[PDB]
């Protein structure tokens, strides 16, 4: 049956190439021999056998077989190398996680400078992203690594979230100890810079807000190399963490340790005065310092910016593919 995973062989896919270096193994583009469907295979290596199957892949197998949303990538199945060993002890073959192939990733589109997003594109993009994030948050899952690389985009304009290797369950009742440094610094929330370890699902909202801003500048907002400098950049824009705007900031471990040069005032609306108002309000609320005052995913969908976006009229990005080959004089 379709459900009997782990048995079908990777012979069933013609490997096209390598689409990236992954955490537990390389990711390959491939074509299904039977159906012709283009897929993506993530290689899982148990040959290290320090801790057997890596947990990063276990989380992605556990969570993505539960999550069914248009803006959440679908794991189609899991296939294996020809074992070629009667004895299971000898077998060191790897496992491949089958996923739907996505034509592009946001980082690739923005980094090459090849795309332009109009307001209506950003609306369609952010509605899908935040709807998917809502589905996940309502299911008590935290992505914990939202970055432009992890946001896949099909040429039609469909957005799918895809790197659930650092994703874990969230309980609003029992606060649990967690791994503090879980997001990329450019997209990391101020709470995780000051070391909450008791992070809320509003860590993922901060990341998406950085992307919202980035889609309007074509450049990331808080680009830094070290944790303190990021807090400085965030503070220059959002204001310095102070108990007046974030009363529980004093409880965070590194609040006294890590301090910005000044107690900066918030200038987010001034430095983003070139953004539409509906979006500026979305950005201002998403980039709120206090995670308990930061907006939820649902609240973003019930905003003037995204409320009335109709996703039937999806908006493909510009994605020029001709006459960019030869530059115009």
């Amino acid at each position: 049956t379709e459900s009997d995973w782990g048995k079908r062989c990777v012979d069933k896919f013609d490997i096209i190439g390598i689409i990236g270096e992954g955490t537990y193994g390389q990711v390959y583009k491939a074509k299904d021999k039977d159906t012709g469907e283009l897929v993506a295979l993530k290689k899982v290596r148990l040959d290290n056998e320090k801790e057997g199957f890596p947990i990063t892949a276990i989380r992605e197998i556990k969570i993505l077989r539960q999550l069914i949303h248009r803006s959440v990538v679908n794991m189609k199945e899991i296939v294996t190398d020809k074992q070629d060993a009667l004895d299971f002890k000898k077998d060191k073959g790897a496992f491949y996680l089958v996923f739907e192939y996505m034509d592009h990733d946001l980082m690739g589109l923005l980094e090459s400078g090849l795309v332009h997003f109009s307001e209506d594109h950003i609306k369609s993009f952010m509605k899908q992203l935040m709807e998917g994030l809502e589905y996940c948050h309502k299911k008590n899952f935290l992505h914990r690594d939202i970055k432009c690389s992890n946001i896949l985009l099909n040429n039609s304009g469909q957005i799918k979230l895809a790197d659930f290797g650092l994703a874990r369950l969230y309980n609003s009742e029992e606060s649990r100890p967690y791994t503090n440094k879980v997001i990329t610094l450019w997209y990391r929330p101020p709470e995780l810079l000051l070391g909450e370890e008791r992070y809320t699902p509003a860590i993922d909202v901060w990341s998406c807000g950085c992307i919202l801003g980035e889609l309007f500048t074509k450049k990331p907002i808080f680009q830094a190399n070290l944790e303190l400098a990021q807090l400085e950049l965030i503070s220059r824009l959002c204001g310095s963490p102070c108990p007046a705007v974030w009363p529980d900031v004093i409880r965070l471990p590194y609040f006294n340790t890590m301090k910005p040069k000044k107690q900066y005032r918030r200038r987010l609306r001034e430095e983003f005065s070139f953004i539409p108002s509906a979006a500026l309000d979305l950005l201002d609320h998403m980039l709120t310092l206090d995670p308990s005052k930061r907006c939820t995913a649902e609240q973003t969908l019930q905003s003037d910016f995204l409320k009335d976006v109709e996703l039937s009229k999806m908006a493909p990005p510009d994605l020029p593919h001709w006459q960019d080959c030869h530059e115009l004089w």
Binding site: I16, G17, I18, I19, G20, E21, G25, Q26, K29, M107, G108, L109, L110, E111, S112, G113, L114, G213, F216, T217, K218, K219, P220, I221, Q223, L233, R236, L237, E270, E271, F272, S273, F274, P320, H321, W322, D324, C325, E327, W329
Partner: protein
């Protein structure tokens, strides 16, 4: 890691901007010409220009303007680089000693902002109270020009109009006032605002908004005798001042797009206008004095003067002389006469300044057998198109071969003593239903000619409607003699067929040497071409014959010969074809993991692929198996302009952001993932757009001419005409030259006080990384031009390594010999 060296053989020749004024002395008339990273200062004589000084800057010159604030005897210069380095400069001369003073300096980049579509704009107030900069959408940056702002610190005013086309500071206003054409969903509009330094905001402007031509392109600030502004479009010119509104729409300007404007008469009576077909116009302001004593603008008139080179910038010097600064063709000095000549023209040519123009492609051939080597370049665009033969005979000797059409790719066939050049010319849909060329050109002046008869796409049934006046490209293969450069033959490709790739090779067991062209069927409807052909030609006995054609389902962007087989990139696919005994192409193997395979290079059984967004991929042919294998891919997202193979392990690439990088196989085989990673090992900001990498040198190296520390010779051509050389170094030689750079940067004074380390830092809108693995040869070759006190200062405490003597001190004279050796590679 890897160690490489980049030197500039020919400096940028394209004119990026020109201004006039009184910069060197309050008395002299100056002409400042800006080429990418280079500033040339001239003095205007009765015969021509007298050069006085040339400086380099560690930045691309984006803004260049002369101004004279109250209290100064002479004009000062503002230059803003494309990396947002701002400065105010002064000329100072002490007898024979000429130097450039940095009066103020600063970087005006904002942490947050969206770069504007129409690029950086810089303007200065007529009272020199402020410098205006339009860097980002929705913001106006005002630098106060007070004696106290030497850090050039500035403030941003919020601008409601997000899409600004052009802006100027207007004349004759009670307060500093700006006139800007902007675009919103309702069309284009002209609007005015006043600028308050005291309030640091905009106040309501003097004259009302008028909605203007949809393609309104340029704003002219007319001087006080008239006041107000002129707006130049595609079809009409309009003057707006207060309630006064004029509009002239002469049919002559509708023909070609107007790109530049300059003021002839300081009163504003006469302005010069230029268009993309080289036509030079005179715009005339017809005055009318009322009894009030007031002078009003009565009417506008446009008069055609003649033809110049397609010009980026124009400047009127004095008497009848105008300087035509060209980016696409040779810059010129032309004299305007009051009486027309017998052909009806008022423009006569005085001087021609060589511009290698956009170097679209190039080939290195030893045509004269001098053992040296010569460079034939595909240079120029449109009517300014030419082939340029360059030899390193101390200057570069440059022969020019005018084509009057755009050259695209060049290859050399020695068996036939000729060159193959792909070209495209512009024809316009005419009343016949066909098209008519604007001027005769190489593809029409060939001795013999042919037109493709292929019926591959002739089934059509796909409608493409034509409107009279629309442009089309007509693509040709030109056969050009290597000695006379006579166009011996020209083959016109099918309608709507673009020629993209050319190779001269022998294939398989075929004795005949062929010309192979790759094409793409381009329709204005298609996002990516879906039809194309690879056609084989034989140039024999003065006629080109059509040996065979292969239909492909895409554009063949690049073709390269692979050990008697044909390697071609069709859209995302990389393919290897075999040449059969039946003289047809047969596919052997394919590779499909590409977004768009734009560039191909080979070495042995290894192939380097250049992608639109996925950087560089090393692919290998497995002869035992008859297929392709992916050896290693670079996973950093870069938009490629050209790729080259340096050696079996190092690979060179050029980014669309004016950056260079080198990738090496990890050469450590602990894991399969490590091998399949191309590690960015060298990063460098060149400052030029590299279209072509070509292996070779123009220097004479046979029969014992002394070789150098550097190994290899890759020549590169760029859009601004710069030609350069990339070569490799040993670890020991790099560290010596790198340590010396750090010493030279502390000693050498930069124009604008721009940090050299900053200038060469890898730079995109999203990244800035410090340079790695590359030695700026132009810094090294500058050691020979610094004064002796400075030379000895540089060599203090300098130690060599990995040599006959592990640690050896350096004297100034030792390095003078080393650098002089390095001057021989270029």
């Amino acid at each position: 890691m890897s160690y490489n060296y980049v030197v500039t053989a020919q400096k940028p020749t394209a004119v990026n901007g020109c201004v006039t004024g009184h910069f060197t002395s309050a008395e002299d008339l100056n002409l400042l010409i800006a080429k990418n990273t280079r500033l040339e200062i001239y003095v205007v004589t009765a015969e021509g220009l007298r050069p006085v000084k040339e400086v380099g800057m560690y930045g691309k010159i984006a803004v260049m303007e002369l101004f004279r604030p109250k209290g100064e005897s002479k004009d000062l210069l503002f230059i803003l680089t494309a990396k947002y380095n701002a400065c105010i400069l002064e000329y100072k001369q002490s007898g024979e000693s000429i130097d450039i003073i940095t009066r103020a300096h600063g970087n005006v980049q904002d942490r947050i902002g969206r770069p504007s579509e129409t690029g950086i704009i810089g303007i200065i107030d007529p009272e020199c109270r402020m410098i205006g900069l339009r860097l980002y959408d929705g913001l106006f940056k005002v630098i106060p020009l007070d004696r106290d702002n030497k850090e050039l610190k500035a403030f941003n005013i919020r601008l409601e109009e997000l899409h600004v086309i052009d802006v100027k500071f207007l004349y004759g206003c009670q307060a500093p006032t700006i006139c800007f054409v902007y675009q919103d969903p309702q069309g284009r509009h002209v609007k005015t605002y006043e600028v308050s330094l005291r309030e640091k905001e905009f106040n309501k402007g003097p004259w009302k908004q008028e909605n203007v031509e949809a393609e309104a392109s340029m704003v002219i600030a007319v001087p006080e005798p008239f006041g107000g502004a002129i707006i130049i479009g595609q079809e009409s010119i309009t003057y707006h001042n207060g309630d006064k509104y004029l509009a002239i729409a002469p049919p002559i300007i509708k023909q070609s797009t107007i790109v530049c404007h300059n003021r002839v008469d300081p009163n504003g009576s006469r302005y010069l206008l230029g268009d993309m077909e080289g036509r030079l116009f005179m715009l005339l302001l017809e005055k009318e004095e009322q009894m009030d004593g007031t002078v009003t603008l009565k009417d506008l008139r446009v008069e055609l003067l003649g033809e110049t080179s397609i010009a980026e910038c124009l400047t009127y010097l004095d008497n009848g002389v105008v300087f035509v600064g060209s980016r696409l063709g040779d810059s010129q000095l032309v004299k305007l006469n009051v009486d027309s000549n017998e052909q009806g023209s008022y423009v006569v040519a005085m001087e021609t300044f060589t511009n290698l123009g956009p170097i679209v492609d190039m080939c290195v051939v030893d045509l004269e057998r001098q053992g040296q080597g010569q460079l034939v370049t595909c240079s120029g665009a449109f009517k300014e198109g030419s082939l340029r033969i360059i030899r390193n005979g101390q200057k570069l000797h440059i022969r020019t071969v005018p084509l009057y059409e755009s050259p695209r790719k060049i290859c050399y066939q020695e068996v036939s003593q000729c060159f193959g050049v792909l070209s495209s010319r512009i024809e316009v849909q005419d009343t016949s239903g066909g098209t008519t060329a604007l001027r005769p050109s190489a593809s029409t002046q060939a001795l013999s000619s042919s037109v493709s008869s292929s019926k591959l796409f002739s089934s059509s049934t796909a409608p493409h409607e034509t409107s009279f006046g629309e442009e089309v490209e007509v693509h040709n293969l030109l056969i050009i003699d290597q000695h006379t450069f006579e166009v011996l033959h020209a083959h016109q490709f099918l309608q709507n067929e673009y020629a993209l790739s050319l190779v001269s090779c022998k294939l398989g067991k075929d004795p005949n040497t062929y010309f192979i062209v790759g094409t793409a069927m381009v329709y204005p409807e298609e996002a990516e071409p879906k039809q194309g052909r690879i056609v084989v030609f034989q140039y024999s006995d003065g006629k080109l014959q059509t040996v065979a054609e292969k239909e492909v389902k895409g554009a063949v962007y690049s073709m390269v010969e692979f050990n008697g087989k044909l390697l071609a990139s069709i859209n995302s696919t990389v393919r290897l074809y075999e040449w059969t005994t039946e003289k047809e192409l047969r596919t052997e193997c394919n590779h499909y993991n590409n977004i768009m395979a734009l560039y191909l290079k080979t070495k042995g059984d290894f192939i380097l692929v250049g992608d639109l967004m996925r950087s560089v991929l090393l692919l290998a042919y497995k002869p035992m198996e008859g297929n392709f294998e992916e050896i290693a891919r670079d996973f950093n997202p870069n938009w490629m302009s050209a790729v080259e193979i340096l050696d079996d392990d190092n690979f060179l690439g050029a980014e669309n952001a004016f950056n260079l990088f080198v990738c090496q196989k990890d050469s450590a085989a602990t894991t399969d993932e490590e091998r399949q990673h191309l590690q960015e090992v060298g990063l460098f900001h060149l400052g030029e757009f590299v279209n072509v990498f070509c292996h070779g040198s123009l220097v004479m190296q046979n029969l014992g001419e002394t070789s150098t520390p550097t190994q290899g010779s890759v020549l590169f051509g760029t859009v601004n005409g710069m030609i350069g050389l990339v070569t490799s170094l040993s670890e020991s030689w790099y560290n010596l030259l790198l340590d010396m750079q750090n010493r030279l940067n502390k000693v050498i004074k930069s124009v604008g006080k721009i940090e050299h380390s900053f200038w060469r830092s890898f730079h995109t809108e999203r990244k800035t990384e410090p340079a790695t693995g590359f030695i700026d040869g132009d810094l090294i070759e500058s050691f020979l031009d610094i004064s002796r006190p400075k030379m000895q200062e540089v060599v203090a405490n300098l130690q060599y390594d990995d040599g006959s003597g592990m640690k050896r001190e350096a004297t100034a004279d030792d390095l003078i010999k080393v650098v002089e050796e390095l001057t021989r590679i270029h």
